[PDB]
Design a protein around this motif. Structure first.
Motif: not given
Lengths: 135, 135, 135, 135
Positions: B12, B15, B19, B119, B123-124, B126-127
């Motif tokens: 993570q 990521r 990003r 963003h 993204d976090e 979504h996980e």
């Protein structure tokens, strides 16, 4: 390694690390583990019932991993085997109790990853609200 | 340096970096800059009108910073001064046009930091949704 | 009632409702309940072991609550008592099995509220990213 | 209308409304408008240069819209035309200055929608963190 970010993105990346690290430390402290000990046990599960050489463990994750493993050996969570033909090499494998510990940790660790993601998103949203409102 | 994270927290963190890095690259590409060039110009603004030694720039941010600075010098954004008593040392200061470029970049960069934070939080989330729904 | 919002804020408020409503419907469907049946059972828990008049239930939450309660009565989850001095009035109280059902629902409902909040925040962040990137 | 939600989802829906409403009120107050006045001006833009009957405005958004429109008429933002064959009917159209006001409001309102979405997602994430950490 991490290539050039703006100072602000770089401080945010460190805040991401600090938040994630603190949440793991708090959950792993309850089982008297560190994240590096959890990472060793998970790595040994991927080859169980076979062992892995202490040097290969360090390479996949070096002198600080022997004290780390000593604690896991004292707890009966791993089993050491000195290679009979090469006495300097110590292979380490998971035991049944190390497998059990990893099964007991599946739920607390998943919740720990959910709390990380939640707190990261809130921290980022606080900074986003601040930037939108100074503009 | 980054101490042991679980594999999942470590991916993570990467990521987060990827990003943020991609959003900066896209905004800085429009001004024909890199984030490391922006970071050099910002560092030179903090001491303007004084210059900073090429080695001290590298230390505060080394051989790749001379090509980096060459591009900024060719664009008239920085001014080099070879120390008369020590010809190996090149002090670099911002010019008026480097100051202007940084003033023109204040709004695009702040928006870039707002898009990063947005963003990252998506993204976090979504996980987090994925983890809550596998449980 | 909801006073004037911009059209866009009004559609977002409806999207908030639709997302929350769908997540509850999916969890309550598993126990063969609706959210209005859960809301009746929770309301009856707040006065248990006493009952509440059918009209007062409707007022605190009217003709559709009798069919709703009929289903709960058939399942043994509530007990009806017709007032001996006023036969038109039916007082309804929770039973032990309605209390048990609410204890079994505490964890699924809390997870349902966590999934609501997660999905709401992601939906909002998708729209925020879209607005920041059209600008 | 809003069908049965759990009490907790219902309070969250009201918090969504309250947050959105407060952010709009603060931006519209700066132009001496309400959101209902903005909604009237936007509705009149969709038919400009034609006008719309006061009753049809109220239906698309009733006695409180005449005072509302009076303020817009006094500001020269709308033009009233009493139907010559039916003097009870007042058609209202946007003026050039009402069009200009809506063009000046495009950016502040879009930022207002971005701040709404940001704050909503943070409020929801605060409640999600609270629920995950009581469990």
């Amino acid at each position: 390694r991490f290539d050039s970010l703006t100072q602000e993105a770089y401080l945010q990346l460190w805040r991401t690390y600090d938040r994630m690290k603190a949440i793991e430390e708090e959950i792993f402290s309850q089982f008297e583990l560190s994240a590096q000990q959890y990472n060793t046990l998970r790595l040994l599960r991927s080859v169980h019932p076979e062992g892995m050489a202490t040097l290969q463990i360090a390479d996949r994750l070096a002198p600080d991993i022997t004290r780390l493993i000593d604690r896991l050996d004292d707890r009966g969570l791993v089993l050491r085997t000195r290679k009979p033909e090469n006495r300097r090499v110590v292979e380490v494998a998971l035991t049944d109790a190390g497998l059990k510990l990893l099964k007991d940790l599946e739920e607390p660790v998943r919740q720990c990853h959910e709390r990380q993601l939640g707190h990261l998103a809130a921290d980022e949203l606080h900074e986003l609200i601040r930037l939108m409102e100074l503009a």
